[PDB]
C-alpha cells in the first residue's frame, strides 16, 4: 500500500551517494501519509522542491531535520509523532544545524541566506513520547513561542526541551490573529491551536474550553467531536474509523466453547491500525500482531499462496543461521574470516550480510585475516536473506556476484541505513550475476560508483519490487552505451532482453527452452541424445527405461509408466530394467517373484513356500 | 527608496494640563504583509539624556509609561497624544519606524511649557582622517537573545540609523549611507558591542547611541545607552 512508507535510520550520517539522496526521499515519501519509523530530512540543498512531503500525517518514530540549507520544509499536515524510536534516544523532534554560517560563499549581497526559517507545523498537536531538541539554526523563528507542554502527551516521560534561540535574524511578531502569542510562523494560519492545557477537568485532550468539548479517551491529537470516530489521531489503534485500545482478538468466546476468530471482525495489529490480513512482507503471529521478526520459541513457516506466519516449536526450535544484526552477530557489522564459516550450508539467513573493505583487507589488531575469495562460496546454497545485502568491497578477481547465484529473495525487513535492501558501491565488478534473484521484499536498491559494472539496465528491476516506494537508484556505474559498444548485451535467447549478465545461463526468462540453467533452442523431444519432455518451458529428462523413438515423440512424463515404449521388461506400475525377484515390498509382506516373457512382460510364476522360480532358479 | 518620516509640529509651547498631539507621516505604509502590526515607535528625549521608548506598534504602550501618553494611527499617518502635559513631560519626542531597512527617524518635536543597562565608553576627540572604536557594555539581560544597533544623533539633533549586529552570530546589516564609515563588531563572551568609525571627517561630529532590540513584540529598539560624543578636531 501507498500511504504507508518505511522509516529511515541514517541519523546525521552523510548520504551514501548524494547525487541520488533527494531521489530516495521522493520515492520513499511521495504518496506517504504514515511513516512507520523515523522521518529524517538531512543534507537538503537550498533550491529543493520538497513538495512530496505534503501528505505526511503520522510519524511512528522521531522527526529529524538536520544539516539542510533549504528555507522551508512543508510538513504542515503532520499531526502526531508517536516517538516509538527516539533521536539520541531522548527526542521525538530534533532540528539541528540547518543554516550554515556560510562564509560569504554567496556574493556579499546574497539574494537571500540559507537555513530553515519557521517550523510550520500547523497540525502537530501530539508527541506521545520524547522531548524536543533544537540547536544551531540561525535563520529559525518561533521555536520558543510554542507551548510544547501542550503538544507532549499527558503520559509523556522524556518531555524535555533544549531549544537554542541564537538567531542572525530578528523575528517579526506572531500574526495579530494569534491571541496568546504562540505560532509556528508569521502567517495567520500558523497559530498554535491548543488541545490539552486549555481543557476541562479530568480529561486528556479536548476541542475547546468546556466538558462538551472533551475528546474521547481513545483520541490523541484532538477531535472534531466527542465520540470515538471523531478523533484526529488515535492513541493506539484505528479499527476502521473507530479508535480502540486493542484490535479485536482472534479467539472469541462463543457462549458454548472457545470458538475461532471473530475474523469477519477479528484483526491484526499493524502499526497503529487494525487490519484483516497482514500486508506483504510481514509475518502473522497468533497473538494478533503483524511483525518483522517472530516471537521467541517460534518458527517462520510459509504457505502455498505466499503468506508467512509464526507458530510454536512444539519440538525443540530447530537451530538457524543468523546474519549480522541478530543474536551473536548483533553488532559485528561485517562478514569476516572470524565468522564466514558460520554461513556454510545455509538455505536462508535470518539477518543481513555486508561486505566492507575490512572483510577483504587485514584488520590485524583484530587478528582476523583477510577473507579469501575462495571462502565466499560458502554462500552457494543460500536462497533467502531476511535482512539486507550490502557490498562496499569485492575481490577484483571476481567478475560478478555469482557466489550469490542462488539467492532468490532479499526480504528487506531490516534495511541498511533504514532505506536500502540491496546496496552495491565501489566494486568494479562487470555484471551482477544474480540469476535466481526474483524479489526484493522491502526497500530500495542502491547501485553506484561501480566503474566497470555493466548489465544494470538489462535487469527488470520493476518485477523484483513489491511495495511502492521501491526503486533502483543508480549513478556513476559504467555508461550504458560504453557496454553494448564492447559486446556486452543480453544473450539472444533472453526473453525481452532481460539478463543478469553475458550468456544463456543469465536470462530471466529464456525465450524458448531451458535445460538446467541454460537457454537452448530445442528440447530433445524428437532428435535427442537423451530423450526429454517439456513441462512449463523446461527440458526434463525421460526415464532411462523409455526407449528412444527415432522420428517420433518418446515420452509424456518423467516417470517410467509415462513412457511410450520400454527398452527392456515391463511391470504394469512402470518401465523396468529387471523383473522383480523377491524384493521387500514392505517391512512385513510377501516377496514378489516374477520372470520375463518373450513378450517383455514380467509374469508371476507358480510356487509353494520354500523353493521358488527365478527364470529356472530356486 | 528610503522611508521618510515627517513630523508636523516642529515645536509646541503650551500650558500645564493642556492636551497636545504630535503627528507623523511616512512616505510608505509602516506595516508588513503577513501582519496588521504597524512598525512605528515613539521615543522621549528629555534634555541631558538618552532617548527612551514610550509606544511601539503605534497602538501599544511600553510598560511603566503613564496613561496620558497614547498611540494612535495605522497605515501611513500616526499621532501621539498627551491628555494633559505635565512638568515631567517637557522633552523632544521622536517618531521612529522599523518596518523597512534602513530604520529611519523623524525630525523631532520639542514641547515646552508656557534591569537593562547599556554602558557606553567615554567621550572622544579625534583628528579628522583617523579612526576611533567606541564600545558598549550590556548588562541585566541575556546578551545573546538580543540585537544591538548604533544610532547617530548629529549637532542639529536628528537621528540616523547606522546598523544592527546579531549578538550571537555577529552578522551585521548596514545602512548604505554608513558602509565605508562604520563597522560593527561584538565580543559576545564579554557582553560588549563595538563600532569603529574610520576616516573621520567633520560631519562625523555627533553623539553615537547604542540601542538594544529583541524579538517578536520586542522587535522595536527599546533601550539606549548614555551616548558617546565623538568630536573631530
Ligand atoms: C482511520 O482510518 C480510516 C480508514 O481506515 C480513515 O478513513 C478514511 O477517511 C478518508 C477521509 O479523511 C476517506 O476518504 C477514506 O475513504 C476513509 O474513510 C480515517 O481517516 C482514519 N481516521 C482516524 C481517526 O485515524
Ligand atoms: O555562538 C556563540 C554563542 O551562541 C549562543 C550560545 O550557544 C552560546 O553558548 C555561544 O557561546
PDB file of C-alpha atoms in Angstrom, chain A residues 397-607:
ATOM      1  CA  UNK A 397      39.435 -11.413  -9.328  1.00  0.00           C
ATOM      2  CA  UNK A 398      35.667 -11.973  -9.228  1.00  0.00           C
ATOM      3  CA  UNK A 399      33.666 -10.551 -12.118  1.00  0.00           C
ATOM      4  CA  UNK A 400      30.237 -10.746 -10.575  1.00  0.00           C
ATOM      5  CA  UNK A 401      28.198 -11.821  -7.582  1.00  0.00           C
ATOM      6  CA  UNK A 402      27.798 -15.468  -8.746  1.00  0.00           C
ATOM      7  CA  UNK A 403      28.724 -16.579  -5.249  1.00  0.00           C
ATOM      8  CA  UNK A 404      25.090 -15.487  -4.610  1.00  0.00           C
ATOM      9  CA  UNK A 405      23.711 -17.002  -7.865  1.00  0.00           C
ATOM     10  CA  UNK A 406      21.088 -18.991  -5.902  1.00  0.00           C
ATOM     11  CA  UNK A 407      19.760 -16.009  -3.956  1.00  0.00           C
ATOM     12  CA  UNK A 408      16.013 -15.841  -4.725  1.00  0.00           C
ATOM     13  CA  UNK A 409      14.719 -13.320  -2.188  1.00  0.00           C
ATOM     14  CA  UNK A 410      16.040 -10.467  -0.072  1.00  0.00           C
ATOM     15  CA  UNK A 411      13.209  -9.583   2.340  1.00  0.00           C
ATOM     16  CA  UNK A 412      14.471  -6.184   3.402  1.00  0.00           C
ATOM     17  CA  UNK A 413      12.758  -6.446   6.769  1.00  0.00           C
ATOM     18  CA  UNK A 414      15.920  -4.954   8.168  1.00  0.00           C
ATOM     19  CA  UNK A 415      17.216  -2.174   5.885  1.00  0.00           C
ATOM     20  CA  UNK A 416      20.682  -0.626   5.617  1.00  0.00           C
ATOM     21  CA  UNK A 417      20.505   2.999   6.724  1.00  0.00           C
ATOM     22  CA  UNK A 418      16.798   2.171   7.224  1.00  0.00           C
ATOM     23  CA  UNK A 419      16.302   2.571   3.443  1.00  0.00           C
ATOM     24  CA  UNK A 420      18.180   0.043   1.261  1.00  0.00           C
ATOM     25  CA  UNK A 421      17.695  -3.730   0.866  1.00  0.00           C
ATOM     26  CA  UNK A 422      20.392  -4.091  -1.792  1.00  0.00           C
ATOM     27  CA  UNK A 423      23.361  -1.678  -1.952  1.00  0.00           C
ATOM     28  CA  UNK A 424      26.464  -2.076  -4.142  1.00  0.00           C
ATOM     29  CA  UNK A 425      29.199   0.611  -4.287  1.00  0.00           C
ATOM     30  CA  UNK A 426      32.849   0.962  -5.329  1.00  0.00           C
ATOM     31  CA  UNK A 427      33.245  -2.554  -6.724  1.00  0.00           C
ATOM     32  CA  UNK A 428      34.377  -2.771 -10.353  1.00  0.00           C
ATOM     33  CA  UNK A 429      32.577  -5.986 -10.978  1.00  0.00           C
ATOM     34  CA  UNK A 430      31.393  -6.167 -14.578  1.00  0.00           C
ATOM     35  CA  UNK A 431      27.908  -7.652 -14.248  1.00  0.00           C
ATOM     36  CA  UNK A 432      25.674  -8.561 -11.363  1.00  0.00           C
ATOM     37  CA  UNK A 433      25.041 -12.260 -12.000  1.00  0.00           C
ATOM     38  CA  UNK A 434      22.215 -12.973  -9.543  1.00  0.00           C
ATOM     39  CA  UNK A 435      20.327 -15.230 -11.974  1.00  0.00           C
ATOM     40  CA  UNK A 436      17.991 -16.556  -9.272  1.00  0.00           C
ATOM     41  CA  UNK A 437      17.045 -13.213  -7.614  1.00  0.00           C
ATOM     42  CA  UNK A 438      13.335 -12.820  -8.132  1.00  0.00           C
ATOM     43  CA  UNK A 439      12.219 -10.387  -5.349  1.00  0.00           C
ATOM     44  CA  UNK A 440      13.441  -7.586  -3.172  1.00  0.00           C
ATOM     45  CA  UNK A 441      10.818  -7.661  -0.449  1.00  0.00           C
ATOM     46  CA  UNK A 442      11.113  -4.197   1.022  1.00  0.00           C
ATOM     47  CA  UNK A 443      13.349  -1.180   0.466  1.00  0.00           C
ATOM     48  CA  UNK A 444      15.157   0.447  -2.387  1.00  0.00           C
ATOM     49  CA  UNK A 445      18.171  -0.692  -4.367  1.00  0.00           C
ATOM     50  CA  UNK A 446      21.270   1.496  -4.487  1.00  0.00           C
ATOM     51  CA  UNK A 447      23.943   0.667  -7.118  1.00  0.00           C
ATOM     52  CA  UNK A 448      26.507   3.419  -7.596  1.00  0.00           C
ATOM     53  CA  UNK A 449      30.173   4.049  -8.295  1.00  0.00           C
ATOM     54  CA  UNK A 450      30.988   0.765  -9.994  1.00  0.00           C
ATOM     55  CA  UNK A 451      33.342   1.863 -12.757  1.00  0.00           C
ATOM     56  CA  UNK A 452      33.158  -1.245 -14.926  1.00  0.00           C
ATOM     57  CA  UNK A 453      29.676  -2.519 -13.958  1.00  0.00           C
ATOM     58  CA  UNK A 454      27.525  -3.221 -16.978  1.00  0.00           C
ATOM     59  CA  UNK A 455      24.220  -5.206 -17.045  1.00  0.00           C
ATOM     60  CA  UNK A 456      22.203  -2.832 -14.848  1.00  0.00           C
ATOM     61  CA  UNK A 457      19.524  -1.629 -17.269  1.00  0.00           C
ATOM     62  CA  UNK A 458      19.263  -5.207 -18.504  1.00  0.00           C
ATOM     63  CA  UNK A 459      17.759  -6.185 -15.133  1.00  0.00           C
ATOM     64  CA  UNK A 460      13.952  -5.987 -14.934  1.00  0.00           C
ATOM     65  CA  UNK A 461      14.025  -4.134 -11.641  1.00  0.00           C
ATOM     66  CA  UNK A 462      10.288  -3.386 -11.636  1.00  0.00           C
ATOM     67  CA  UNK A 463       9.486  -7.097 -11.285  1.00  0.00           C
ATOM     68  CA  UNK A 464      11.696  -7.558  -8.226  1.00  0.00           C
ATOM     69  CA  UNK A 465       9.827  -4.787  -6.386  1.00  0.00           C
ATOM     70  CA  UNK A 466       6.755  -5.434  -4.320  1.00  0.00           C
ATOM     71  CA  UNK A 467       5.537  -2.424  -2.295  1.00  0.00           C
ATOM     72  CA  UNK A 468       5.542   1.018  -3.954  1.00  0.00           C
ATOM     73  CA  UNK A 469       8.246   3.381  -2.673  1.00  0.00           C
ATOM     74  CA  UNK A 470      10.802   0.939  -4.045  1.00  0.00           C
ATOM     75  CA  UNK A 471      13.238   1.959  -6.696  1.00  0.00           C
ATOM     76  CA  UNK A 472      16.555   1.396  -8.185  1.00  0.00           C
ATOM     77  CA  UNK A 473      18.872   4.341  -7.544  1.00  0.00           C
ATOM     78  CA  UNK A 474      21.891   4.318  -9.750  1.00  0.00           C
ATOM     79  CA  UNK A 475      24.710   6.586 -10.809  1.00  0.00           C
ATOM     80  CA  UNK A 476      28.431   6.520 -11.606  1.00  0.00           C
ATOM     81  CA  UNK A 477      28.405   2.978 -12.956  1.00  0.00           C
ATOM     82  CA  UNK A 478      29.764   2.281 -16.424  1.00  0.00           C
ATOM     83  CA  UNK A 479      27.956   4.244 -19.243  1.00  0.00           C
ATOM     84  CA  UNK A 480      25.232   2.064 -20.717  1.00  0.00           C
ATOM     85  CA  UNK A 481      26.363   2.529 -24.312  1.00  0.00           C
ATOM     86  CA  UNK A 482      30.027   2.029 -23.478  1.00  0.00           C
ATOM     87  CA  UNK A 483      28.689  -1.511 -22.665  1.00  0.00           C
ATOM     88  CA  UNK A 484      26.920  -2.601 -25.867  1.00  0.00           C
ATOM     89  CA  UNK A 485      29.807  -0.936 -27.697  1.00  0.00           C
ATOM     90  CA  UNK A 486      32.130  -3.643 -26.344  1.00  0.00           C
ATOM     91  CA  UNK A 487      29.722  -6.606 -26.947  1.00  0.00           C
ATOM     92  CA  UNK A 488      28.065  -6.938 -23.552  1.00  0.00           C
ATOM     93  CA  UNK A 489      24.396  -7.356 -24.228  1.00  0.00           C
ATOM     94  CA  UNK A 490      21.914  -9.982 -23.241  1.00  0.00           C
ATOM     95  CA  UNK A 491      22.039 -13.349 -24.917  1.00  0.00           C
ATOM     96  CA  UNK A 492      19.769 -13.503 -27.955  1.00  0.00           C
ATOM     97  CA  UNK A 493      17.756 -16.208 -26.203  1.00  0.00           C
ATOM     98  CA  UNK A 494      16.976 -13.989 -23.208  1.00  0.00           C
ATOM     99  CA  UNK A 495      13.270 -13.151 -23.328  1.00  0.00           C
ATOM    100  CA  UNK A 496      12.631  -9.443 -23.830  1.00  0.00           C
ATOM    101  CA  UNK A 497      16.308  -8.570 -23.323  1.00  0.00           C
ATOM    102  CA  UNK A 498      16.405  -9.171 -19.573  1.00  0.00           C
ATOM    103  CA  UNK A 499      19.535 -10.806 -18.175  1.00  0.00           C
ATOM    104  CA  UNK A 500      21.920 -10.524 -15.222  1.00  0.00           C
ATOM    105  CA  UNK A 501      24.940 -10.952 -17.494  1.00  0.00           C
ATOM    106  CA  UNK A 502      26.613 -12.490 -20.521  1.00  0.00           C
ATOM    107  CA  UNK A 503      25.386 -15.757 -21.919  1.00  0.00           C
ATOM    108  CA  UNK A 504      22.416 -18.120 -21.780  1.00  0.00           C
ATOM    109  CA  UNK A 505      22.953 -19.004 -18.117  1.00  0.00           C
ATOM    110  CA  UNK A 506      21.886 -15.466 -17.143  1.00  0.00           C
ATOM    111  CA  UNK A 507      18.488 -14.983 -18.773  1.00  0.00           C
ATOM    112  CA  UNK A 508      15.450 -14.069 -16.686  1.00  0.00           C
ATOM    113  CA  UNK A 509      13.048 -15.935 -18.940  1.00  0.00           C
ATOM    114  CA  UNK A 510      14.514 -17.895 -21.866  1.00  0.00           C
ATOM    115  CA  UNK A 511      12.555 -17.075 -24.976  1.00  0.00           C
ATOM    116  CA  UNK A 512      12.469 -20.744 -25.902  1.00  0.00           C
ATOM    117  CA  UNK A 513      13.580 -23.564 -23.639  1.00  0.00           C
ATOM    118  CA  UNK A 514      15.658 -24.035 -20.537  1.00  0.00           C
ATOM    119  CA  UNK A 515      17.724 -27.172 -19.891  1.00  0.00           C
ATOM    120  CA  UNK A 516      19.011 -26.944 -16.313  1.00  0.00           C
ATOM    121  CA  UNK A 517      20.182 -23.349 -16.002  1.00  0.00           C
ATOM    122  CA  UNK A 518      20.988 -22.690 -19.735  1.00  0.00           C
ATOM    123  CA  UNK A 519      18.721 -21.436 -22.530  1.00  0.00           C
ATOM    124  CA  UNK A 520      18.531 -23.651 -25.590  1.00  0.00           C
ATOM    125  CA  UNK A 521      16.700 -23.518 -28.938  1.00  0.00           C
ATOM    126  CA  UNK A 522      15.194 -27.062 -28.859  1.00  0.00           C
ATOM    127  CA  UNK A 523      14.462 -29.635 -26.204  1.00  0.00           C
ATOM    128  CA  UNK A 524      15.346 -33.185 -27.301  1.00  0.00           C
ATOM    129  CA  UNK A 525      11.709 -34.229 -27.716  1.00  0.00           C
ATOM    130  CA  UNK A 526      12.448 -35.966 -31.057  1.00  0.00           C
ATOM    131  CA  UNK A 527      16.076 -35.979 -32.265  1.00  0.00           C
ATOM    132  CA  UNK A 528      17.810 -36.171 -28.957  1.00  0.00           C
ATOM    133  CA  UNK A 529      20.915 -37.617 -27.368  1.00  0.00           C
ATOM    134  CA  UNK A 530      18.935 -38.314 -24.181  1.00  0.00           C
ATOM    135  CA  UNK A 531      15.164 -38.124 -24.814  1.00  0.00           C
ATOM    136  CA  UNK A 532      13.252 -35.493 -22.847  1.00  0.00           C
ATOM    137  CA  UNK A 533       9.827 -33.892 -22.470  1.00  0.00           C
ATOM    138  CA  UNK A 534       8.663 -30.309 -21.986  1.00  0.00           C
ATOM    139  CA  UNK A 535       6.970 -29.022 -18.844  1.00  0.00           C
ATOM    140  CA  UNK A 536       6.266 -25.343 -18.197  1.00  0.00           C
ATOM    141  CA  UNK A 537       9.005 -24.425 -20.707  1.00  0.00           C
ATOM    142  CA  UNK A 538      11.664 -26.750 -19.194  1.00  0.00           C
ATOM    143  CA  UNK A 539      13.563 -29.670 -20.714  1.00  0.00           C
ATOM    144  CA  UNK A 540      13.369 -32.532 -18.151  1.00  0.00           C
ATOM    145  CA  UNK A 541      14.810 -35.987 -18.863  1.00  0.00           C
ATOM    146  CA  UNK A 542      12.772 -39.082 -19.772  1.00  0.00           C
ATOM    147  CA  UNK A 543      13.057 -42.165 -17.713  1.00  0.00           C
ATOM    148  CA  UNK A 544      16.101 -44.389 -18.518  1.00  0.00           C
ATOM    149  CA  UNK A 545      13.651 -47.176 -19.352  1.00  0.00           C
ATOM    150  CA  UNK A 546      11.717 -45.320 -22.073  1.00  0.00           C
ATOM    151  CA  UNK A 547      13.132 -46.405 -25.433  1.00  0.00           C
ATOM    152  CA  UNK A 548      14.387 -43.860 -27.953  1.00  0.00           C
ATOM    153  CA  UNK A 549      11.798 -43.325 -30.714  1.00  0.00           C
ATOM    154  CA  UNK A 550      13.628 -42.397 -33.920  1.00  0.00           C
ATOM    155  CA  UNK A 551      11.435 -39.731 -35.649  1.00  0.00           C
ATOM    156  CA  UNK A 552       8.518 -39.642 -33.164  1.00  0.00           C
ATOM    157  CA  UNK A 553       7.966 -38.465 -29.572  1.00  0.00           C
ATOM    158  CA  UNK A 554       9.416 -40.640 -26.833  1.00  0.00           C
ATOM    159  CA  UNK A 555       7.538 -39.928 -23.665  1.00  0.00           C
ATOM    160  CA  UNK A 556       4.970 -37.789 -21.967  1.00  0.00           C
ATOM    161  CA  UNK A 557       6.333 -37.595 -18.413  1.00  0.00           C
ATOM    162  CA  UNK A 558       9.408 -38.217 -16.258  1.00  0.00           C
ATOM    163  CA  UNK A 559       8.112 -41.476 -14.736  1.00  0.00           C
ATOM    164  CA  UNK A 560       8.529 -44.938 -16.231  1.00  0.00           C
ATOM    165  CA  UNK A 561       4.765 -45.527 -16.608  1.00  0.00           C
ATOM    166  CA  UNK A 562       4.658 -42.280 -18.601  1.00  0.00           C
ATOM    167  CA  UNK A 563       6.984 -43.872 -21.177  1.00  0.00           C
ATOM    168  CA  UNK A 564       5.997 -44.530 -24.730  1.00  0.00           C
ATOM    169  CA  UNK A 565       7.640 -47.908 -25.127  1.00  0.00           C
ATOM    170  CA  UNK A 566      10.013 -49.547 -22.769  1.00  0.00           C
ATOM    171  CA  UNK A 567      13.534 -50.675 -23.652  1.00  0.00           C
ATOM    172  CA  UNK A 568      13.540 -53.947 -21.686  1.00  0.00           C
ATOM    173  CA  UNK A 569      10.856 -55.637 -19.499  1.00  0.00           C
ATOM    174  CA  UNK A 570       7.520 -54.244 -18.314  1.00  0.00           C
ATOM    175  CA  UNK A 571       5.789 -54.440 -14.960  1.00  0.00           C
ATOM    176  CA  UNK A 572       2.481 -52.521 -15.070  1.00  0.00           C
ATOM    177  CA  UNK A 573       3.463 -49.868 -12.446  1.00  0.00           C
ATOM    178  CA  UNK A 574       6.156 -48.730 -14.867  1.00  0.00           C
ATOM    179  CA  UNK A 575       9.079 -49.413 -17.323  1.00  0.00           C
ATOM    180  CA  UNK A 576      11.736 -51.598 -15.620  1.00  0.00           C
ATOM    181  CA  UNK A 577      15.211 -52.994 -16.414  1.00  0.00           C
ATOM    182  CA  UNK A 578      14.921 -56.224 -14.417  1.00  0.00           C
ATOM    183  CA  UNK A 579      11.733 -58.182 -13.498  1.00  0.00           C
ATOM    184  CA  UNK A 580      11.471 -58.238  -9.695  1.00  0.00           C
ATOM    185  CA  UNK A 581      12.682 -61.301  -7.743  1.00  0.00           C
ATOM    186  CA  UNK A 582      11.792 -61.305  -4.094  1.00  0.00           C
ATOM    187  CA  UNK A 583      12.355 -57.715  -3.080  1.00  0.00           C
ATOM    188  CA  UNK A 584      10.966 -56.435   0.219  1.00  0.00           C
ATOM    189  CA  UNK A 585       7.640 -54.734  -0.774  1.00  0.00           C
ATOM    190  CA  UNK A 586       7.081 -53.768   2.855  1.00  0.00           C
ATOM    191  CA  UNK A 587       8.591 -54.461   6.274  1.00  0.00           C
ATOM    192  CA  UNK A 588       6.186 -57.376   6.759  1.00  0.00           C
ATOM    193  CA  UNK A 589       4.952 -58.504   3.332  1.00  0.00           C
ATOM    194  CA  UNK A 590       5.339 -61.417   0.896  1.00  0.00           C
ATOM    195  CA  UNK A 591       8.085 -61.215  -1.737  1.00  0.00           C
ATOM    196  CA  UNK A 592       7.193 -60.732  -5.389  1.00  0.00           C
ATOM    197  CA  UNK A 593       8.848 -63.348  -7.643  1.00  0.00           C
ATOM    198  CA  UNK A 594       8.453 -62.789 -11.396  1.00  0.00           C
ATOM    199  CA  UNK A 595      10.097 -63.705 -14.652  1.00  0.00           C
ATOM    200  CA  UNK A 596      10.393 -62.412 -18.230  1.00  0.00           C
ATOM    201  CA  UNK A 597       8.355 -63.344 -21.199  1.00  0.00           C
ATOM    202  CA  UNK A 598       9.433 -63.281 -24.818  1.00  0.00           C
ATOM    203  CA  UNK A 599       6.790 -60.509 -24.866  1.00  0.00           C
ATOM    204  CA  UNK A 600       8.865 -58.481 -22.345  1.00  0.00           C
ATOM    205  CA  UNK A 601       6.126 -58.827 -19.705  1.00  0.00           C
ATOM    206  CA  UNK A 602       7.023 -59.773 -16.151  1.00  0.00           C
ATOM    207  CA  UNK A 603       4.556 -62.512 -15.275  1.00  0.00           C
ATOM    208  CA  UNK A 604       4.285 -64.131 -11.807  1.00  0.00           C
ATOM    209  CA  UNK A 605       5.194 -67.827 -11.557  1.00  0.00           C
ATOM    210  CA  UNK A 606       3.711 -70.810  -9.631  1.00  0.00           C
ATOM    211  CA  UNK A 607       5.193 -71.679  -6.214  1.00  0.00           C
TER     212      UNK A 607
END
